[PDB]
């Protein structure tokens, strides 16, 4: 089922040590009985390290640099701040400044600072995913998967603004404002529904839901045979995996293995922002209007 | 024909309807009574779709499109060429889907597993029924449904959206998107986690689930677990689709105005409604 | 143009990728066979992938897939028709024989070990510092079968130490012997533990473990297998 009927607790687990520097690990946190009814009850420890701190510090700087701007907009009034929270917006520099780093602060400079902070924040955290894996002797699938996501973000606020000739083409920091920018970005390029990457991207998004639905319900359906213990079922096929494979073979004609299903997985999700990134990159650099392009194919 | 370990599983029984009658296979596929049901509904539906295509005078799939009845017909029947054909086709789809679900149930039983897969699928089926049955009824004409055509359907989406402004402001739409993005994120991770443990560094031994558990605690200070990430996955997807239905079933029924405008409720709370400055003052 | 280039490129990428994806899921249960066990004639467009070898922790050897497949156990099934595609009927007791929804795999007769090399799963009595932290503690509650008759009593909980999870309940039968029951196939009520798959009279048939403080992959499969099979095979004894 979706919830455990009974919870059990033991001494806090400090984990595998492999090549990890145990000096950089925190201490275990409290146990949540709340988290316990769904998954593991154990909070922490977490690994700090140099990259974690840089990431974590730049991360907050980004968030705060935006935060002060919102307050400056709110007339430092906590009431307005709450009323107008989704309306505030930190916008990129005007098209006038181009790829200039000299825009005045109220006119776009503050946006550059925030972005610079985000840039470092994100890349350091990427390097963090990689190293954490290295130090345990694991594959770097997580860092590479992560790179896909990074691709779309790189393209939205960095690579495309640069290839277009101005930062003004980037995404503003704001709740309603980044929604508007999105809606508007499609209007300008002749309706993104004709961008075949966009369409591909949607297929993989829809698919991710389809698959994670399929995989999840399956593993639950056979957890009565210890299905969730996937690494050992990969190393020694249990009846759980057979029932799993056979349920699907009998339904739609072919099937996965336990290692296999997880390759379907990582690629279906990774293709969302991979294709995505490409659809957006060509948008406005090589193709000005996807409908017209749809008319020619060229 | 059989997987090296399949035979011991191919025993009689588990059928919901009709005993041993359709209790058999065709190549890898399991038939069952509902095996037959879905085939019949699928045959019929595709036929009708081709029939629509001649009345339309195109065989090109990018062009073919079967439209519902126009609003003037309300929730009554319409002539074939004028909307009947879509109505049957819709009946046939439903027939297909539901049947496909019940077959999943029948396979579940024969194998002795839970019913989580058929159950999860029913959410997909319910989203489809929302868009072609529940919303049009409630609105008052089959004409509010989306047409069956590759691009025409994308058009319905675009037109229906823009009717209420930027649809981005539909609040349940915001929530539904959150689950879609978050689910993908989680499918990305889960897959990557298991693979990296099963496929370590060159020459190293297969990692342990423990290593996995550790990798994550080190990364974000927490690890949900094997039975967890699988319940999680199931929850995000089912949820994504649940909210997707919700955002539509309310649109046009209990809210027909611009979605952005619905946010005025927040901004017009009397305690800050008149306070000057900001964006709205 | 560029765009046209990119998209044509991608549809090609995607095609070899599926091909990859597909051949990787062919490392088990392939190649295909006929109902008599002889290799099938048509194995599909996809070749078997080149084998890969897994290096198993705790000096437990290696695993190479695809590799020689064998059930490594008798199957008590007989054909019910003269052509391919029909069910195979059990020739004895499906439960005892382990066919059908009661099937089990000839996994290793060694327990799963945690990251450190200790037995992953343990009776809680022998798991230093583990206690039921939430929910109803089953231990001591009678166990009821689908026929609404009492079959035994929980005398311990077998826990998963690395993940701090309840995997099985250890139940003591009327003759003083005990069986493991998968956690995922029991309903914990406030005054009893209800088992819908097995009727009281079948609990004794639940396969036993050779050592009282350990379970092996083989014994997990034989047990889960058996209990699951009750759902279809105990059916005449189940009332509600
Ligand atoms: C422009 C786009 C640029 C934008 C940048 C975004 C890039 C994001 C890419 C993310 C990839 C996620 C992949 C996940 C994964 O497997 O990672 C682990 C994988 C192995 O990790 P490991 O820790 O090193 O090894 C652990 C084990 O030893 C080994 O572990 P293992 O067995 O799990 O790994 C083996 C794995 C090895 O995986 C790889 O080698 C990755 C390949 C990366 C491809 C990048 C895609 C680019 C998209 C191009 C689209 C064209 C549009 C223009 O096998 C595969 O997955 C094979 C992929 C099959 C591809 C099919 C290609 C078909 C070519 C056409 C043939 C003709 C068809 C007939 C008609 O990582 C990589 O190999 C790194 C790839 C990094 C390249 C980035 C590109 C640089 C720019
Ligand atoms: C639910 C949200 C909206 C909507 C919004 C969009 C948007 C937005 C997009 C699509 C896209 C697609 N839509 Mg749609 N779509 C809706 C409802 C549907 C219905 C339905 C019966 O309810 C179906 C079958 C489809 C099917 C499709 C595909 C043609 C295409 C890729 C989807 C995909 O990868 O999913 C994931 C599923 C899988 C990978 C499993 C395999 C699915 C295959 C591809 C199914 C194809 C069926 C199709 C060819 C018709 C067969 C019917 C007859 C039997 C012949 N949509 C509603 C109205 N749809 C994208 C596109 O590019 O098409 C123009 C796109 O950009
Ligand atoms: C009016 C709106 C337009 C439109 C305009 C756009 C635009 C513009 C874009 C999309 C994009 C997308 N669209 Mg569209 N789109 C429309 C209608 C639709 C419809 C529909 C009608 O049903 C659907 C289903 C979609 C679906 C989608 C997605 C498939 C795709 C983004 C995938 C993704 O997951 O990115 C989500 C993931 C990311 C952004 C990656 C970011 C990762 C970073 C590193 C995260 C860092 C976090 C930060 C550091 C803070 C840390 C967090 C805190 C610790 C909490 N569109 C119409 C036609 N669409 C994108 C695309 O790819 O298009 C091709 C895009 O740029
Ligand atoms: C392949 C495509 C999908 C994908 C994959 C993906 N994302 C990833 C990964 C992968 C494989 C990681 O490994 C990496 C990760 O570490 O996840 C655990 C990541 C990640 N994706 C994230 C977010 C994210 N991914 C997204 C999308 C997607 N990621 C795709 C759908 C999105 C969107 C917009 O859909 C978001 C928002 C992060 C959780 C994590 C990268 C973390 C990071 O880079 O941090 C840098 C900076 C900081 C440390 C900032 C911290 C600042 C905060 C303290 C401020 C906010 C405070 C707030 C009010 C707190 C309260 C929250 C309440 C809920 C309690
Ligand atoms: C609820 C979460 C997500 C989900 C889950 C889900 N889907 C599922 C399942 C699950 C758990 C299955 O078990 C089942 C499956 O077997 O997967 C392999 C299924 C499935 N999801 C499918 C597709 C699908 N799921 C989708 C969505 C989702 N599925 C969700 C996002 C989508 C989209 C658009 O997002 C699609 C396209 C099928 C691959 C498969 C169900 C197959 C099936 O029902 O077969 C019976 C029907 C036929 C053989 C064809 C019938 C032909 C009709 C009679 C006529 C055609 C009419 C149609 C309306 C025309 C539409 C034209 C378009 C261009 C608009
Ligand atoms: C860990 O475990 C797991 C497995 O394995 C151990 C698995 O395999 C799977 C399943 C997943 C995969 C194999 C990965 C790839 C899957 C997808 C990307 C999902 C998308 C699927 C499709 C596009 C296939 C859709 C196909 C269908 C519905 C069937 C095709 C059918 C036909 C052509 C005929 C349909 C049948 C009819 C008309 C009626 C019945 C038949 C008669 C003849 C009567 C999962 C989830 C899993 O978790
Ligand atoms: C081998 O295995 C594995 C493990 O184990 C060893 C693991 O640890 C992990 C690691 C995994 C994790 C640490 C978990 C990661 C966590 C997440 C990816 C996200 C979890 C987040 C959520 C459940 C919620 C997301 C929130 C969303 C979508 C938006 C916020 C909104 C809401 C909750 C709803 C708000 C609504 C209201 C009040 C309704 C309002 C109504 C109307 C508007 C109408 C993995 C991958 C794994 O594979
Ligand atoms: C409670 O009040 C305090 C002050 C305590 C707070 O902390 C509150 C803070 C909040 C109010 C913060 C609110 C923050 C949000 C509303 C943020 C929303 C952010 C988004 C919706 C972002 C969407 C998209 C962002 C994109 C795509 C960013 C892309 C960035 C980049 C790729 C970076 C590019 C780098 C640049 C241009 C500079 C590079 C320079 C070099 C030298 C390399
Ligand atoms: C992981 C393999 C599954 C990939 C699904 C491929 C089918 C998607 C079809 C999308 C139709 C797209 N397009 C380009 C015309 O917009
Ligand atoms: C993006 C393409 C989606 C449609 C693909 C449908 C394939 C159905 C699976 C057929 C497998 C066949 N079999 C059993 C004869 O081997
Ligand atoms: C978009 C998803 C499409 C799925 C790709 C179809 C793969 C079909 C594989 C059929 C395998 C045939 N076999 C060997 C099982 O008989
Ligand atoms: C799954 C059902 C989906 C709806 C399919 C269309 C049904 C239309 C019914 C109209 C028949 C006539 N009328 C108006 C007299 O009721
Ligand atoms: Fe999994």
Check if A1-139 and A140-298 are the same fold: yes
Q: Can you tell me the distance from the alpha carbon of B120 to that of A176, in angstroms, rounded to the nearest whole number?
A: 33
User: Which residues in chain C are contacts of A235 at CB distance < 8 A?
Assistant: 54, 56, 63
Picking from A57, A47, A44, the residue whose alpha carbon sits closest to that of residue A24 is: A47
φ, ψ of residue B132 to 5 degrees: the values are -110, -5
B239 HSE (CA, 13 A, CB side): 16
Q: β-strand C165-173 against C150-160: which pairing, if any?
A: antiparallel
Rg (C-alpha) for chain C, rounded Å, is 23
SS3 A129: helix
C61 Cβ contact list (under 8 Å, min separation 6): none
Phi, psi of C152 (to 5 degrees): 180, -160
Report residue A134: phi and psi, to 5°: -60, -45
With contact defined as beta carbons under 8 Å apart, do C188 and A1 qualify? Answer: no
Task: Domain B164-263: give its CATH architecture.
Answer: Up-down Bundle (1.20)
Long-range CB contacts for residues A68-73, cutoff 8 Å, separation at least 24: A69/A110, A73/B278, A73/B279
Going by their DSSP bridges, the two strands C131-135 and C165-173 should be labelled as unpaired
Question: CB-based contacts of A239: which residues, under 8 Å, 6+ apart?
Answer: A225, C103, C104, C105, C221, C224, C225
Contact residues, C window 95-114, toward A, CB-based 8 Å cutoff: 103-105, 107-108, 112
Give C139's Cβ-side CA count (13 Å radius). Answer: 14
The distance of Cα A252 from the centroid of its chain, to the nearest Å, equals 31
A:94-133 residues touching chain B, CB 8 A cutoff = 128-129, 132-133
Q: Is C172 on the interface with A (CB under 8 A)?
A: no
Question: Would you list the DSSP string of chain B?
Answer: -B-TT-GGG--S---SSSTTSS--EETTEE--HHHHHHHHHHHHHHHHHHHHHHHHT---TTT--B----GGGTTS---GGGTHHHHHHHHHHHHHHHHHHHHHHHHHHHHT--SHHHHHHHHHHHHHHIIIIIHHHHHT-GGGSPPBSTTHHHHHHHHHHHTTS-GGG-HHHHHHHHHHHHHHHHHHHHHHHHHHHHS-STT-----HHHHHHHHHHHHSB---HHHHHHHHHHHHHHHHHHHHHHHHTBTTTB-S-GGGGGHHHHT-TTTTT--SSS--
Query: How do the domains of chain B map onto residue ranges?
Result: 1-163, 164-263
Helix B226-249 × helix A196-221 angle, to 10°: 130
User: What token pair was written down for B66?
Assistant: 């079967």
Give the residue carrying structure tokens 């101005």. A166
Q: Which residues pair with C52 in a beta bridge?
A: C65
- On chain C, the residues whose CB falls within 8 A of the CB of A11 are 128-129
Tally Cβ neighbours within 10 Å of residue C71: 13
Residue A165, chain B, CB below 8 Å: the answer is no
| Contacts of A among chains (3+ CB pairs under 8 A) | B, C
CATH topology of domain A1-139: Photosynthetic Reaction Center, subunit M; domain 1 (1.20.85)
Q: How many CA atoms lie within 13 A of C201 on its CB side?
A: 8
The tokens for B236 are: 């995000």
Question: How large is the C-alpha radius of gyration of chain B?
Answer: 25
Q: Is B79 helix (H, G, I), strand (E, B) or coil?
A: coil
Helix axes A258-281, A141-154, angle to 10 degrees: 20
Contacts of B168 (CB under 8 A, 6+ apart): A179, A180, A182, A183, B174, B259
Class in CATH terms, A140-298? mainly alpha
Q: Pick from C33, C84, C87: which is nearest to B23 by CB?
A: C87
Q: Please give the backbone phi and psi of residue A296, each rounded to the nearest 5 degrees, phi first.
A: -95, -50
Per the entry, the structure determination technique was: X-ray
DSSP for residue B164: T
- What is the rounded radius of gyration, in angstroms, for the C-alpha atoms of chain A? 24
* Binding partners of B (≥3 Cβ pairs within 8 A): A, C
For residue A76, what are its two tokens?
Answer: 């430092």
Asked if A29's CB is within 8 angstroms of B263's CB, the reply is: no
**Looking at chain A, which runs of residues are DSSP E strands?**
6-9
Q: Name the minimum distance, in Å, from the CA of B33 to any CA of chain C.
A: 14
Whether residues B184 and A272 touch (CB distance < 8 A) is answered with: yes
Q: How far apart are CA B197 and CA B216, in angstroms?
A: 12
Question: How many other CB atoms are there within 10 angstroms of residue B18's CB atom?
Answer: 12
Eight-state DSSP code of residue B132: I
User: B140, B74 in Cβ contact below 8 A?
Assistant: yes
A68-92 core/surface letters (b: 16 or more CB in 10 A; e: else): ebbeebbeebebbbebbbbbbbbbb
For chain A, positions 177-216, list CB contacts with chain B under 8 A.
Answer: 179-180, 182-183, 191, 193, 199, 205, 208-216
Using an 8 Å CB-CB cutoff, list chain B residues near C40: 1-2
Q: Is A262 annotated to bind ligand?
A: yes
Annotated ligand binding at B211? The verdict is no
Q: Specify whether the CB–CB gap between A199 and A125 falls below 8 A.
A: no
User: What distance in Å separates the CA atoms of residue B142 and residue B132, rounded to the nearest whole number?
Assistant: 7
* CA dihedral over C11, C14, C19, C22, signed as positive or negative: negative
**CB-CB neighbours of C16 under 10 Å:** 9
Q: Which of residues 41-80 of A touch C (CB under 8 A)?
A: 41-42
Ligand 1 pocket by Cβ (under 6 Å): A 139-141, 144-145, 147-148, 151, 266, 270, 274; B 195, 199, 202; C 6, 9-10, 12-13, 15-17, 20
Smallest CA-to-CA distance from B66 within B74, B76, B80 is with B80
- Taking CA B231 as the corner, what is the angle to CA B228 and CA B233, rounded to the nearest 5 degrees? 105
Sign of CA dihedral B103, B105, B109, B114: positive
| Domain B1-163 sits in CATH 3.30.70.120 | no
Residue extents of the structural domains in chain A: 1-139, 140-298
Q: Testing the interface with B: which of A14, A80, A135, A213 to mutate, by most B Cβ within 10 A?
A: A213
* Nearest chain A alpha carbon to B203: A137
Same fold, B1-163 and B164-263: yes
Residue with tokens 């198993």: C56
Please name the member of A82, A205, A220 whose beta carbon is closest to the beta carbon of B180: A205
CB of B189 less than 8 A from some CB of A: yes
> How far apart are the C-alpha atoms of B138 and B74, rounded to whole Å?
11
- CA distances in angstroms from B177 to A276, B174, B180, B229, B247, listed in the order given: 16, 5, 5, 20, 11
CA dihedral B128, B129, B135, B138 (to 10 degrees): 180
| Residue that is written with structure tokens 């739409």 in the block | B173
Q: What is the CATH number of domain C107-239?
A: 3.90.50.10
Is residue B164 within 8 A of residue B171, CB to CB? The reply is no
Cross-chain Cβ contact B1/C69 below 8 Å = no
Burial class of residue C86 in the structure, from the number of CB atoms within 10 Å of its CB (0-12 exposed, 13-18 middle, 19+ buried): middle
- The DSSP output letter for C159 is E
Q: Ligand 4 atom 13: the closest Cα is on which residue?
A: A146
Q: What does each C-alpha distance from A195 to A140, B147, B231 come to in angstroms?
A: 32, 21, 35
Q: Which two tokens stand for residue C212?
A: 């009282």
Residue C167 CA: distances (Å) to CA of C73, C121, C160, C183 = 26, 8, 6, 5
**Per-residue tokens: B153:** 């359907």
Distance from CA of A181 to the nearest CA of C (A): 23
Domain ranges across chain C: 2-106, 107-239
CATH class of C2-106: few secondary structures
């Amino acid at each position: 089922d979706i919830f455990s009927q009974v919870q059990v607790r033991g001494p806090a687990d400090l984990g595998m040590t492999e090549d990890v520097n145990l000096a950089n690990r925190s201490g275990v946190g409290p146990f949540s009985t709340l988290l316990g009814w769904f998954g593991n009850a154990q909070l922490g420890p977490i690994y700090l390290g140099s990259l974690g701190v840089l990431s974590l510090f730049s991360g907050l700087m980004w968030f705060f640099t935006i935060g002060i701007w919102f307050w400056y907009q709110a007339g430092w009034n906590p009431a307005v701040f709450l009323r107008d929270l989704f309306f505030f917006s930190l916008e990129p520099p005007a098209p006038e400044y181009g790829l200039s780093f000299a825009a005045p602060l109220k006119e776009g400079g503050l946006w550059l600072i925030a972005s610079f902070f985000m840039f470092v924040a994100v890349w350091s955290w990427w390097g963090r995913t990689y190293l954490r894996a290295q130090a345990l002797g694991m594959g770097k699938h997580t860092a590479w998967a992560f790179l896909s996501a990074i691709w779309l973000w790189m393209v939205l606020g960095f690579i495309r603004p640069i290839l277009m000739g101005s930062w003004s083409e980037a995404v503003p920091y704001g709740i309603f404002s980044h929604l508007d920018w999105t809606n508007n970005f499609s209007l300008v390029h002749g309706n993104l529904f004709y961008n075949p990457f966009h369409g591909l991207s949607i297929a993989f998004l829809y698919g991710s839901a389809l698959l994670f639905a399929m995989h999840g319900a399956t593993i639950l359906a056979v957890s009565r045979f210890g299905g969730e213990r996937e690494l050992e079922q990969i190393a020694d096929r249990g009846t759980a995996a057979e029932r799993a494979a056979l349920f699907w073979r009998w339904t739609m004609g072919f099937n996965a293995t336990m290692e296999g299903i997880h390759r379907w997985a990582i690629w279906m999700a990774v293709l969302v922002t991979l294709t995505g990134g490409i659809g957006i990159l060509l948008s406005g650099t090589v193709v000005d209007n996807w409908y017209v392009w749809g008319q020619n194919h060229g | 024909a059989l997987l090296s370990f399949e035979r011991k599983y191919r025993v009689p029984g588990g059928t919901l309807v009709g005993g041993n009658l359709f209790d058999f296979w065709v190549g890898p596929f399991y038939v069952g009574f509902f095996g037959v049901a879905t085939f019949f509904f699928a045959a019929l539906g595709i036929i009708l779709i081709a029939w629509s295509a001649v009345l339309q005078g195109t065989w090109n799939p990018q062009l073919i499109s079967v439209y519902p009845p126009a609003l003037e017909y309300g929730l009554g029947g319409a002539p074939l060429a004028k909307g009947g054909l879509w109505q049957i086709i819709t009946i046939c789809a439903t027939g297909a889907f539901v049947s496909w679900a019940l077959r999943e149930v029948e396979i579940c039983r024969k194998l002795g597993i839970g019913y989580h897969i058929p159950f999860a699928f029913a959410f997909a089926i319910l989203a489809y029924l929302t868009l072609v049955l529940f919303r049009p009824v409630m609105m008052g004409a089959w004409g509010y449904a989306f047409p069956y055509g590759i691009w025409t359907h994308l058009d319905w989406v675009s037109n229906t959206g823009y009717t209420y402004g930027n649809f981005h402001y539909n609040p349940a739409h915001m929530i539904a998107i959150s689950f879609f993005f978050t689910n993908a994120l989680a499918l990305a991770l889960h897959g990557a986690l298991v693979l990296s443990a099963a496929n370590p560094e060159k020459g190293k031994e297969m990692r342990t689930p423990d290593h996995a558990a550790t990798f994550f605690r080190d990364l974000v200070g927490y690890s949900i677990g094997t039975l967890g990430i699988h319940r999680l996955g199931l929850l995000l997807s089912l949820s994504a689709v649940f909210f997707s239905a919700l955002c539509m079933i309310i649109t046009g029924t209990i809210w027909f105005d611009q979605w952005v405008d619905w946010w005025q409720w927040w901004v017009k709370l009397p305690w800050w409604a008149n306070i000057p400055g900001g964006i709205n003052g | 143009d560029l765009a046209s280039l990119a998209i044509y490129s991608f549809w090609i990428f995607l095609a070899g990728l599926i091909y990859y994806l597909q051949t990787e899921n062919m490392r088990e249960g392939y190649p295909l066979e006929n109902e008599d066990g002889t290799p099938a004639a048509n194995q599909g467009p996809f070749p078997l992938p080149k084998p890969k070898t897994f290096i198993l922790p705790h000096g437990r050897g290696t695993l190479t897939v695809p590799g020689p497949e064998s059930e490594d156990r008798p199957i008590a099934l007989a054909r019910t028709a003269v052509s391919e595609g029909f069910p195979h009927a059990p020739t004895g007791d499906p439960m005892k024989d382990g066919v059908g929804p009661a099937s089990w795999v000839a996994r290793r007769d060694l327990p799963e070990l945690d990251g450190h090399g200790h037995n992953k799963i343990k009776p809680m009595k022998a798991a230093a510092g583990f206690h039921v932290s939430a929910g109803k503690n089953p231990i001591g509650l009678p166990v009821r079968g689908c026929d609404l008759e009492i079959a035994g009593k929980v005398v311990d909980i077998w826990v998963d130490i690395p993940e701090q999870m309840a995997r099985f309940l250890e139940v003591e039968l009327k003759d003083g012997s005990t069986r493991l029951l998968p956690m995922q196939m029991v309903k914990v009520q406030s005054n009893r533990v209800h088992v819908n798959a097995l009727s009281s009279d079948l609990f004794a048939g639940i396969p036993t473990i050779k050592s009282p403080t350990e379970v092996t992959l083989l014994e997990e499969d034989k047990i889960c297998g058996y209990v699951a099979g009750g759902l279809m095979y105990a059916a005449p004894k189940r009332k509600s």
